[PDB]
């Protein structure tokens, strides 16, 4: 509120709102936003000569193809809401079926987080909850990307996950800390961050950064657009120039490292 703006090196973005008690109106309020993924396009659009505006999402979190219809950013792109689409987006079999993807720039996948006793997806503990000890719980945020992938290979675990579904991210970690859950499953690109900027390094990932179903993050564009060749080539060029390492360090810090 000093000047009704925010400091330089940050891009404004028009966030929608659902109005006050849905009585009337609902104000498109200008509030600038920053982060990692937004920073990369700011430097990117200095060599392809873009002009851009941002507006955040309306409904859902990422998307799901249910009843032969889509909603989410993937839903937005398939109906031409925006030519480009950035942010936390996961490349997968179903997603690439309808919309094209670029070359990924950061590697990731899925992982498990526990407090302070098993080997992984084949561990016999995960196989059946019929052991002597009382059953433990999973985090497994619904309506996500992993859940659709998890359903694909073996079902009996997911119907167990249906009984207990976590909400949000921060709400899940405190529940694990208190002892409401015991095995949180989510993508690794963010769990390593949360374990890093934490208190006491009490939370870790299993093994030496063990990863399952390695996957990359990238930018999705509309099918058949001529932007494909240029956006691919430019994104690859910054990787060679040693820029990803520098941008990673600032927004990927290690306290427990």
């Amino acid at each position, epitope marked *: 509120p000093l000047t009704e703006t925010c400091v330089r090196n940050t891009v404004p973005c028009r966030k*929608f709102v659902k109005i006050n008690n849905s009585t009337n109106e*609902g*104000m*498109n309020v200008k509030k600038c936003c920053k982060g990692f993924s937004i920073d990369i396009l700011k430097k990117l659009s200095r060599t392809v000569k873009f002009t851009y505006d941002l507006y955040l999402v309306t409904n859902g979190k990422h998307g799901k193809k249910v009843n032969n*219809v889509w909603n989410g950013m993937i839903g937005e792109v398939v*109906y*031409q809401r925006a*030519v480009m689409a950035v942010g936390s987006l996961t490349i997968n079999e179903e997603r690439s079926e309808v919309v094209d993807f670029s070359v990924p720039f950061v590697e990731t996948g899925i992982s498990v987080m526990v407090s302070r006793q098993v080997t992984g997806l084949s561990d016999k503990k995960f196989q059946r909850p019929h052991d002597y000890s009382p059953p433990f719980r999973f985090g497994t945020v619904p309506n996500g990307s992993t859940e659709r992938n998890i359903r694909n290979n073996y079902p009996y675990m997911h119907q167990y996950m249906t009984k207990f579904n976590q909400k949000g991210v921060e709400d899940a970690l405190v529940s694990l800390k208190t002892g409401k859950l015991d095995a949180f499953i989510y993508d690794a690109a963010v769990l390593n961050y949360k374990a890093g900027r934490d208190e006491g390094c009490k939370l870790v990932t299993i093994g030496s950064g063990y990863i399952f179903a390695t996957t990359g993050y990238g930018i999705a564009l*509309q099918k058949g657009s001529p932007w494909k060749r240029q956006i691919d080539l430019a994104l690859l060029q910054f990787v060679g120039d040693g820029e990803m390492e520098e941008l990673e360090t600032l927004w990927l810090t290690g306290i427990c490292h």
Partner: nanobody
Amino acid sequence: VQLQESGGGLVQAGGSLRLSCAASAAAAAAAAAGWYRQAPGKERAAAAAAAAAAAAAAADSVKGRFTISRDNAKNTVYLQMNSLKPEDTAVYYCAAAAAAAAAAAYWGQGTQVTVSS
């Protein structure tokens, strides 16, 4: 802003119609125009779209039956529909979004299209 839809009626299966939605505005170059369908017992569904750049997307469900067009000179978007089937019986709606504004979902009174023997 306010729009207005028209063009409905009763037409035998395999026939054609020309629905139309129009609105008043001095900036009419830049609005997404979309067609929505909502039959009794089913949720609202997208049918056809037109982008600001000038690209056309058609839903795969009833792909090829109808076609979309927009006139930059005159503020009206009319939907040319052909080879009617009973599966298309519904009330079609027109909408716009973005280029300013707020509370962004805009719906006309509605035009009912009836396909039957």
